Amino acid sequence: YQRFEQAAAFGVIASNANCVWIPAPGQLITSALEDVNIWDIKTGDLVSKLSDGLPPGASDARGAKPAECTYLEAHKDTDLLAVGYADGVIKVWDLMSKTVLLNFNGHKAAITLLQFDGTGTRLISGSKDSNIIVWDLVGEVGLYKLRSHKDSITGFWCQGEDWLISTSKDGMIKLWDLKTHQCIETHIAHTGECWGLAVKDDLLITTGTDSQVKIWKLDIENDKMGGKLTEMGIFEKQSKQRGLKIEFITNSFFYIQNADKTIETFRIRXXXXXXXXXXXXXXXXXXXXXXXXXXXXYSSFILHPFQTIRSLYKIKSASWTTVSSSKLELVLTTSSNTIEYYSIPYEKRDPTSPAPLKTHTIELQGQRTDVRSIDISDDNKLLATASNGSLKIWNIKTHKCIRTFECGYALTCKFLPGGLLVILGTRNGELQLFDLASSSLLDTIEDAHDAAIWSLDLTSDGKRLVTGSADKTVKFWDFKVLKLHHDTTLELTDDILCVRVSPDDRYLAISLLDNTVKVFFLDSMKFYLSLYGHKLPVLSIDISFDSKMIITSSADKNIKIWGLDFGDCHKSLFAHQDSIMNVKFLPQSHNFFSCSKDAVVKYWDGEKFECIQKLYAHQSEVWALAVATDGGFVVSSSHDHSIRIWEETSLKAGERLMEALDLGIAEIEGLEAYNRDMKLXXXXXXXXXXXKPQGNAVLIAVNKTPEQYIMDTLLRIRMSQLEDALMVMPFSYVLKFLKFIDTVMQNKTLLHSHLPLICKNLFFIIKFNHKELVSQKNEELKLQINRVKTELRSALKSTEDDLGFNVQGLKFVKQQWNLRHNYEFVDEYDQQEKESNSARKRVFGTVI
């Protein structure tokens, strides 16, 4: 067998996380899948990647998709990059040592926000569920967990060490206390959720769902109801859409990023900047107090609208700097694996330019959209073909690209070995041939088809070509020297989705729009055979290198291996729980790699049809697959722009109360003799006392008082076990238990909580142990029972006076209503019949 492991992943420039910025012409750290990407803004190419030695398919990764780096945050003092992953695990990365050192996990969901301060060296994490967990990097223990939200965490701010402010994915905002571990105030923000939170020390800004921000002011007011956090202003006009992340920097500008390609920048002002504006508003109020209340209902006092920034791809992450307080520079990561650098000049008054400057762009190494098809040359030269038109030429030994072109709505690509030319298939009915040494648009045949083409293949010579389309046609093409021409077009019954030419150059299989695979003789077009029984249109057709067996699979998640000689089958194998997309063959052995929509690439054998290897490189869809013609490395093209290349290699009741009785009363007799010490110390002479005998560490860890710690063991003993575990206690502990009740009687609050339980327990011990308790002479026992009988009777009479008052008091309330509201009846036998009908009736099961 073999063990193939992935070498690297490419086109992973910007994943779904917030980036961070490094000073120096700055540097930028973005997110990758199971990695993070770090480069220069100036050059753009990678300088390092942060991962351990874990490839999927090896002993490290198991049967699950890898954790996407869904958040990262870096501090420039310790050079620690705290990354949040998709399964709630928390990793921290040394930048110079490129190694993870601590690996916590406390969340069951993906980590949304991370904010960590090196001033106390603490790490605060926020996930997609409610829990905010604060770790410390010096003790590696989850110190205090903040759990009061209901939906999620999306806002985040830590203010030293007494408060914490967070917003959830339902429109409500919390403030907690450090010391008291609980919340203080909650306040709803919007009807929908409040995504973004940016904080300056005076104002808190929170966006909503319908292009609405709320400007809130914090205070250190100790009032119970209000004044902790107020809601004076609402500003509008971001877009029609709403923001997700808001961030602010000083010399006094802040920005909000939407989901509709729109970053909006607004300027906040200060005291005299708004106080002169207040006089300007007072000049507006003069031109009763209608305008003054309209100046209190307002947002031009703080929010000065600077400008908006319109991108073309969906804006994902943004962090921004400023240089010399005149040029604010904004870094952007798009939906695609592309980086935008936006620089805006200002003189603290004017936007100074209509559009932001694109001084730095990273586009030449990503994928820019979803990649659709792959090409592998004979000497390991890769090509990638995407949807919007990025045909990129990659080399494995560099792990980089050479150049990229523009090629329309391209779908498929086949590589001609002769001259190293690339045949390209667009969704438009046209063909393209692109060269390496010369230019690209030499001879691109327009109007070759009407509808969308879906499959291309070629002969082993390369001079003959086939184009399968949804025009219910397949067209044969030949190259005459320097242009392609059509040779033979066959109409068919349905749309054609997958075409493969045989490596023996004798067969040409066609996947129709039905569940039919019809294979023709390549020499003659003579309708050799048809296959049927897939229940869905077939997406991938393969035949072996020696041309004995056909391997096909459709969207109904099964591989139905056929026989090329007779049209029989060998194995119908269900796998790949979403839908099977593509099948590729090893060029020397009967082995087929299946890539599918559920992010799994499986390697099977053609002689046992069991899973020999299972690959879990990523989590999104796998669009195409490719296998090298001589070596055997497998290239997988993903939906999230990933190119993975796989190079091959005890106690009992009664006893529990006894230890409770022995521990507490030795502590009780400990404090009793100590109380007699200070009565003999600080009264007569001086006398250096015992200086507080220490309580037990078992007592002080839970911090239960010794009367209480004995007491709840009585509740923990069950009701039928108590009568038999109370006679296992001998008379020496009986004298202790009488001393225990005489000490818990001094706290009347503790007695009345479980007074009938104490009454049942005490008057069973003394009832059973009566002969020893009476015929043992002790003045202390005479005093202790005298204290406990007079106090238990007084406590029982106190709770019996309340019961008997409520019985007699509310019987009066009943009988007063029964003469006031009740209209009584004179007719005695008719009244007693009516009361029997008006009385309560209940049904019970009986036996006659």
Binding site: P756, D802, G809
Partner: protein
């Protein structure tokens, strides 16, 4: 009145009856009482409470009877010694 609806719920069991009996006594001693004489309309609901209290009155008075076993224990020990 809504507290008295919740007070009837707490009186149903035999552990929370001390809180339930204190709250009804709070209505008739600690509150504004002549105002509470004025207001009708709840008196059907308050009548469903009372035979639970008479069970709890008879149980507690039986516990007073079991508390005089100590009075026998103190007298007989004093007589013997």
């Amino acid at each position: 009145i809504l507290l008295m609806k919740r007070c009837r719920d707490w009186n149903t069991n035999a552990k929370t009856h001390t809180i339930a009996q204190r709250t009804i006594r709070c209505i008739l001693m600690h509150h504004n009482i002549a105002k509470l004489s004025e207001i009708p309309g709840m008196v059907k609901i308050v009548d469903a409470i009372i035979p639970y209290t008479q069970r709890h009155f008879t149980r507690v008075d039986n516990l007073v009877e079991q508390s005089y076993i100590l009075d026998y224990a103190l007298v007989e020990m004093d007589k013997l010694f």
